[PDB]
Amino acid sequence: EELKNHVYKKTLQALIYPISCTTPHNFEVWTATTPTYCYECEGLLWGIARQGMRCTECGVKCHEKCQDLLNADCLQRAAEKSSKHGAEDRTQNIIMVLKDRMKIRERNKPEIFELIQEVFAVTKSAHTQQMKAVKQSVLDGTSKWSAKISITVVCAQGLQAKDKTGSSDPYVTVQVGKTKKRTKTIYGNLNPVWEENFHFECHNSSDRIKVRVWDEDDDIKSRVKQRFKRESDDFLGQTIIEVRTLSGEMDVWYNLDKRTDKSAVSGAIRLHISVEIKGEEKVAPYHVQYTCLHENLFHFVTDVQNNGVVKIPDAKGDDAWKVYYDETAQEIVDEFAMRYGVESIYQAMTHFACLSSKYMCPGVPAVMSTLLANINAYYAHTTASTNVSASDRFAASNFGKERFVKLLDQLHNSLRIDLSMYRNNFPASSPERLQDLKSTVDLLTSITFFRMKVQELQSPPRASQVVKDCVKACLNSTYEYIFNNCHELYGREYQTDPAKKGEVPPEEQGPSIKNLDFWSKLITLIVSIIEEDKNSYTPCLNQFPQELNVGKISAEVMWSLFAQDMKYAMEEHDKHRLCKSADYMNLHFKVKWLYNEYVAELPTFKDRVPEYPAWFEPFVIQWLDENEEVSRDFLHGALERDKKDGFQQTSEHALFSCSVVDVFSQLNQSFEIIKKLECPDPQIVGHYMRRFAKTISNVLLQYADIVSKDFASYCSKEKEKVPCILMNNTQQLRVQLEKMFEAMGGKELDAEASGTLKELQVKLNNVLDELSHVFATSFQPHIEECVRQMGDILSQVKGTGNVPASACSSVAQDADNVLQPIMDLLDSNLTLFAKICEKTVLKRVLKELWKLVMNTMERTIVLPPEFLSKLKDHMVREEAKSLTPKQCAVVELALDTIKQYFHAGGVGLKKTFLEKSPDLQSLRYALSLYTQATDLLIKTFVQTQSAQGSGVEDPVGEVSVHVELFTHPGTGEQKVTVKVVAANDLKWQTSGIFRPFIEVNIVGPQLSDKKRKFATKSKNNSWAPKYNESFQFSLSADAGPECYELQVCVKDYCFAREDRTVGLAVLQLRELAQRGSAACWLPLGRRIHMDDTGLTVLRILSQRSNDEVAKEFVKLKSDTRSAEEGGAAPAP
């Protein structure tokens, strides 16, 4: 309180006689009427050469250059001068002008003295009496003011350089009126420390302490300059402290001022000044008094007048930060400050300290930010001509550097705290609180900038980061809040039934294992918060657009917190599985959406494959399973409907039945769900796809199987359409499966899923082939019956150039008659199938039917097994009747017609398949044999019967031959020398005289003109008869040795009886074509061993029963061992 009361008396004294209505000095040019020293610089005013200015009113005398340094009040100076010259009437007249000025002041502005009175809580009476007392204290002039002054010159900082060295030798002169003293000199230092105390007696508060800093030039140039100018010691700067601005024990940095235009000046001087004023002992410094005034006035204005509200003054321009109050309150502090030397920056740092307590109050952070940007700009920028850091210039603050640093730190912390609950503390529902939030951050920036610029701090906590942390802290607390209040918030903000808006349990305004609804609701609240941050707070907090986006930070933190929680929750749900598959899928869609809407695009998570699908995968897999069962049970339903409906084709162009459509619909529904998940993890997708491909495979094979199992039962004659439809179903599976394979990404599908479906497609292709075969097979008995009827008709056609006109009916008409049984079948069925079968189904059916027809015709018509019996075999002495040229024709034409039928003008099988058909080629081959020439048949026999030259089985002896093929050295024909050496092991211990001889026969083409047979002599009673007899066949010239074979026959010579065949051996002359000559022991057989073509050629040749070559060939091949004396039938 003791300071409060004194500050009140001083403030009344200040404002009763304010500086703003001090009288100006009326300076006449004056020639000094006595040897005079300038009241400001103490230079000799004398004569015309050292004229000064004399103020008429105050009789202060100064140089012209000094008249403006005289801030001394003209009226007080006048009262003093008048006193020091003994002019008492003038003194009293000035005391009367001083009284009238104080009466004017009270009359004009009583509200000042009233506001002082209220700010200091003084009574109107004690105010009026103190007012009378301070009026007298001003009218004491300075005749009744005196002081002792103790001036410790502490230091200067940042002085100018004036020496040849680029430094200075600073010393200080302190002058107080009549007395001049000097510090010792500090050499070479721009930041000198003196710490030197002078004592002075001051009889006049309008004296001025002239503290002049000088460079001590003792040199010749100084001794020269001394003649012309009174300040030889090259002037470094001054401070001119008005003695009215002294109070108690002061400790003050004074910036140094320019005395003259040639003065370069920089830096400050710290002066510790104790002043012992008469009637004002032990008073506080005017800085401390001003602080006390400003604090009381602030607490009065804010708390007492405005109930706590900080009334921001209407103030504009670069001096707005110097306006703290309304006019009256402003004039109080300004007149106090101006009268008592309190610099504007001190006033500001003080008011900033006041505002720092009320920083929560509306608009204050803007004012404070502005004020601090000015305080910043002051210390940071002012005068680059200084050689001192902003931090050191700020260490010369009379507010105290430390104090302001601490003040800013406390404030910065208070701002950090409030920003750590920014949503609550600055609700979006108040734009003004959003603007205070904005200005709270702008103040935090201004503080950080002040730390960076004024304090020159190397690493201040970066404002953007500090705020980002605050935002994180708030977001955490927000997250907690919503995470504790979820149902209330959601109920209120979104729920369309009011009965659901209320207080659902804390465990459901928080997580539940029984239901996901908390999470759904939490997501919508997270969205609401992220949107509020995006929409309200991000525009609000745009100060660091490249470093702070509140919507991004909100999304990141909220998703992070949510994601950790959700991940634990999904893990927990994965254990319990109390909610349904569908619910987790819906949650998955929501989380997917949330993520993809707000999170996917944040750099932090565009940088990743999203992890949330891994939470849901177990649930999607469970769903895929459930879906498989549902699919397989649906399938049996779908099939049972279709089966009961007898498999109607869906329509006359949808050649498949309905169950296909049902099933693929079910599959497609199932697939589309998965596909809509769009799971961003390709391995989880591969897993889903593998899982699902199995589903597909299982279902579709089970379809194919159910069909395949019943298929044969439908292949009966009344339901021909149903097999076609089932084949079309099957094929429609293949088609829809290719669609589905492609819909599953085709080439972009996972390798095992793709493999599975390619497998499935090949299996299904094969099912269709089997079904096509099973179908074609139900026609086989009819095709056989038909082809037997075609055979019954063709038997009536023979070699008809010598037969009646119903069978010498044209080759065409006989072909048509022959075909009629099968064309009744074919035309109807192939035209029906061509309609009701899909084109893939039709082609497969047709191949299976074509083969079946060709083979049936080959077997039943061209090579009927009874033609073994009727001229291959022994059964009937008939000529069999060959396929006659006319019946070879007719058949070849029936076949071209069948081929045209199966071609169906391109609707059936390609002409190319039909022509290349091995079935047709085989049929043509057998046919070609029936007309072929005797020699060509015989050549064919030798070339085909290759196995008649690789070991007789069950031999009846053997023959040693030596054989020399001569590509006859005399002709280039071939001749065959055959030395019959011996026989051995003849199984012929006979019922008589055995008389073996060896017939040798050559066989092959073109032998009609040639000796086909030789024989050895006979040998009596000899199972090992030697012969040593050499024969010489001629071959043709044309046919090579490979067209020929020797046939070696042992016979028992039997006059009266018949010469019994003992045995037979074949030697292929192809071998001899390499060997040139061969010794060989031919094993003897009972009959020659044959293939189908030997036996076919033989039954053909036997029909040529007038051709002598054929007769002898047939006879020769049809020779077998007359069984007896050693056995009947051989092995091949």
Cβ atoms 346, 286 nearer than 8 A: no
b/e map of 53-70 (b: 16 or more CB within 10 Å)? Answer: bbbebbbbbbbebbbebb
Annotated binding-site residue? 470: no
Helix axes 581-598, 658-677, angle to 10 degrees: 50
E-strand spans in 266-350? 268-277
Annotated binding-site residue? 565: no
Cβ atoms 251, 270 nearer than 8 A: yes
Annotated binding-site residue? 292: no
In the Cβ-directed half-sphere of 27, how many Cα atoms lie within 13 Å? Answer: 16
Query: Cα separation of 498 and 804, whole Å?
Result: 106
Helices (H), 186-303: 220-228, 286-299
Query: Cα separation of 844 and 717, whole Å?
Result: 19
One-letter amino acid for residue 865 of the chain = P
Count the neighbouring beta carbons within 10 Å of the beta carbon of residue 652.
8
Query: Cα separation of 649 and 261, whole Å?
Result: 115
- Write the CB contacts of 567 (distance below 8 Å, at least 6 apart in sequence): 611, 612, 615
Closest CA to 1050 of 976, 977, 1125, 944: 1125
Query: Cα separation of 700 and 694, whole Å?
Result: 10
Burial class of residue 29, CB neighbours in 10 A (0-12, 13-18, 19+): exposed
Q: Say which CATH class 936-1117 falls into.
A: mainly beta
Count the neighbouring beta carbons within 10 Å of the beta carbon of residue 767.
23
Annotated binding-site residue? 326: no
- Beta strands across the sheet bearing 1060-1068: 1013-1015, 996-1003, 1045-1052, 1060-1068
Query: Cα separation of 372 and 537, whole Å?
Result: 24
Beta strands 27-30 and 36-37: pairing type? unpaired
Query: Cα separation of 1117 and 778, whole Å?
Result: 43
Cβ atoms 846, 902 nearer than 8 A: yes
Count the neighbouring beta carbons within 10 Å of the beta carbon of residue 921.
12
Q: What tokens appear for 554 in the block?
A: 């909100």
Query: Cα separation of 42 and 990, whole Å?
Result: 181
Annotated binding-site residue? 705: no
Burial class of residue 544, CB neighbours in 10 A (0-12, 13-18, 19+): middle
Q: What tokens appear for 1107 in the block?
A: 């051709």
User: What one-character DSSP code corresponds to residue 537?
Assistant: I
Annotated binding-site residue? 985: no
Beta strands 36-37 and 44-45: pairing type? antiparallel
Residue with tokens 């959003």: 434
Query: Cα separation of 148 and 1058, whole Å?
Result: 183
CATH number at 2-139: 3.30.60.20
3-state secondary structure of 116: helix
Cα separations in angstroms, 298 against 305, 307, 325, 702, 802 = 10, 12, 8, 91, 147
- Beta strands across the sheet bearing 170-176: 179-182, 170-176, 208-215, 235-242
Annotated binding-site residue? 954: no
In angstroms, how far is CA 230 from the centroid of its own chain? Answer: 83
Torsion, CA 331, CA 332, CA 335, CA 337, rounded to 10: -120
Cβ atoms 1004, 944 nearer than 8 A: no
State the DSSP H helix or E strand holding residue 37, giving kind and residue range, or none if neither. strand 36-37
Closest CA to 798 of 728, 879, 869: 879
Residues paired with residue 1066 on neighbouring β-strands, in sequence order: 1047
3-state secondary structure of 651: coil
Query: Cα separation of 1027 and 1041, whole Å?
Result: 25
Query: Cα separation of 259 and 237, whole Å?
Result: 7
User: What does 233-247 look like in DSSP terms, one character per residue?
Assistant: S-EEEEEEEEGGG--
One-letter amino acid for residue 775 of the chain = F
Query: Cα separation of 1120 and 1090, whole Å?
Result: 13
Cβ atoms 230, 41 nearer than 8 A: yes
User: What does 447-477 look like in DSSP terms, one character per residue?
Assistant: HHHHHHHTS--SS---HHHHHHHHHHHHHHH
Q: What tokens appear for 995 in the block?
A: 């008389």
Query: Cα separation of 977 and 969, whole Å?
Result: 13
User: What does 545-576 look like in DSSP terms, one character per residue?
Assistant: TTT--HHHHHHHHHHHHHHHHHHHHHHHHHHH
Burial class of residue 606, CB neighbours in 10 A (0-12, 13-18, 19+): exposed
Q: Is 843 left (phi over 0), alpha (psi -120 to 50) or beta?
A: alpha
Query: Cα separation of 590 and 521, whole Å?
Result: 11
Query: Cα separation of 836 and 656, whole Å?
Result: 9
What determination technique applies here?
cryo-EM
Closest CA to 618 of 663, 560, 577: 577
Query: Cα separation of 687 and 409, whole Å?
Result: 57
Residues paired with residue 1085 on neighbouring β-strands, in sequence order: 1064
Annotated binding-site residue? 38: yes
Count the neighbouring beta carbons within 10 Å of the beta carbon of residue 417.
12
Query: Cα separation of 929 and 407, whole Å?
Result: 123
Residues paired with residue 197 on neighbouring β-strands, in sequence order: 152
Q: What tokens appear for 806 in the block?
A: 């119903």
Residues of the chain with CATH 2.60.40.150: 147-277, 936-1117
Annotated binding-site residue? 89: no
Closest CA to 250 of 177, 175, 154, 172: 154
Query: Cα separation of 841 and 729, whole Å?
Result: 10
Q: Is 985 left (phi over 0), alpha (psi -120 to 50) or beta?
A: left
**Please, what is the end-to-end C-alpha distance for the chain in angstroms?**
144
Count the neighbouring beta carbons within 10 Å of the beta carbon of residue 132.
10
Query: Cα separation of 503 and 491, whole Å?
Result: 8
Phi, psi of 147 (to 5 degrees): -150, 150
Please provide the size of the chain in residues.
1132
3-state secondary structure of 1049: strand
In the Cβ-directed half-sphere of 1041, how many Cα atoms lie within 13 Å? Answer: 25
Residues of the chain with CATH 1.10.357.50: 617-774
E-strand spans in 43-146? 44-45, 52-55, 61-62
Beta strands 1026-1034 and 27-30: pairing type? unpaired
Rg (CA), the chain: 66
Cβ atoms 1023, 986 nearer than 8 A: yes
Query: Cα separation of 787 and 856, whole Å?
Result: 7
- Beta strands across the sheet bearing 27-30: 27-30, 52-55, 61-62
Cβ atoms 562, 526 nearer than 8 A: yes
Residues paired with residue 1083 on neighbouring β-strands, in sequence order: 958
Query: Cα separation of 808 and 797, whole Å?
Result: 7
Burial class of residue 567, CB neighbours in 10 A (0-12, 13-18, 19+): middle
User: What does 857-926 look like in DSSP terms, one character per residue?
Assistant: HIIIIIS-THHIIIIISSS--S------HHHHHHHHHHHHHHHHHHHGGGTSS-HHHHHT-HHHHHHHHH
3-state secondary structure of 71: coil
One-letter amino acid for residue 806 of the chain = S
Q: What tokens appear for 496 in the block?
A: 């369309």
3-state secondary structure of 649: strand
Cβ atoms 198, 307 nearer than 8 A: no
User: What one-character DSSP code corresponds to residue 183?
Assistant: P
Cβ atoms 898, 819 nearer than 8 A: yes
- Write the CB contacts of 943 (distance below 8 Å, at least 6 apart in sequence): 1042, 1043
- Beta strands across the sheet bearing 974-984: 1026-1034, 974-984, 958-967, 1077-1083
- Write the CB contacts of 482 (distance below 8 Å, at least 6 apart in sequence): 489, 522, 525, 526, 529
Torsion, CA 208, CA 213, CA 219, CA 225, rounded to 10: -50
Cα separations in angstroms, 516 against 325, 586, 614 = 59, 10, 17
- Write the CB contacts of 188 (distance below 8 Å, at least 6 apart in sequence): 163, 165, 167, 168, 169
Annotated binding-site residue? 217: yes
Q: What tokens appear for 1022 in the block?
A: 């000899």
Q: Say which CATH class 617-774 falls into.
A: mainly alpha
Cβ atoms 372, 399 nearer than 8 A: no
- Write the CB contacts of 672 (distance below 8 Å, at least 6 apart in sequence): none
Query: Cα separation of 828 and 846, whole Å?
Result: 13
3-state secondary structure of 634: helix
Cα separations in angstroms, 902 against 546, 743, 771, 783, 856 = 79, 37, 19, 14, 15
Residues of the chain with CATH 3.30.60.20: 2-139
Cβ atoms 1047, 927 nearer than 8 A: no
Torsion, CA 1015, CA 1020, CA 1021, CA 1025, rounded to 10: -50
CATH number at 780-931: 1.20.58.1100
Phi, psi of 235 (to 5 degrees): -65, 125
In angstroms, how far is CA 77 from the centroid of its own chain? Answer: 85
Q: Resolution limit in angstroms?
A: 10.0
Q: Is 141 left (phi over 0), alpha (psi -120 to 50) or beta?
A: left
CATH number at 147-277: 2.60.40.150
Closest CA to 732 of 665, 792, 656, 808: 656
In angstroms, how far is CA 744 from the centroid of its own chain? Answer: 20
Angle at 1044 between CA 1043 and CA 1047, to 5 degrees: 155
Cβ atoms 816, 826 nearer than 8 A: no
Tell me, letter by letter, the H, E, C secondary structure of 844-857: HHHHHHHHHHHHHH
Annotated binding-site residue? 55: yes
Q: What tokens appear for 961 in the block?
A: 């031959």
Q: Is the dihedral of CA 836, 841, 843, 847 positive or negative?
A: negative
3-state secondary structure of 1123: coil
Query: Cα separation of 708 and 732, whole Å?
Result: 15
Count the neighbouring beta carbons within 10 Å of the beta carbon of residue 810.
13
Residue with tokens 């930070």: 553
Query: Cα separation of 130 and 598, whole Å?
Result: 71
Q: What tokens appear for 574 in the block?
A: 């994965």
Closest CA to 587 of 561, 613, 607: 613
Cβ atoms 254, 275 nearer than 8 A: no
Query: Cα separation of 1035 and 880, whole Å?
Result: 32
3-state secondary structure of 508: coil
Phi, psi of 439 (to 5 degrees): -70, -25
Q: What tokens appear for 287 in the block?
A: 């800085």
Phi, psi of 660 (to 5 degrees): -55, -50
Q: Is the dihedral of CA 1045, 1051, 1055, 1057 positive or negative?
A: negative
Cβ atoms 237, 256 nearer than 8 A: yes
Longest CA pairwise span in the chain (Å): 207
Query: Cα separation of 735 and 455, whole Å?
Result: 79
Phi, psi of 386 (to 5 degrees): -65, 150
Q: Is 235 left (phi over 0), alpha (psi -120 to 50) or beta?
A: beta
Cβ atoms 470, 419 nearer than 8 A: yes
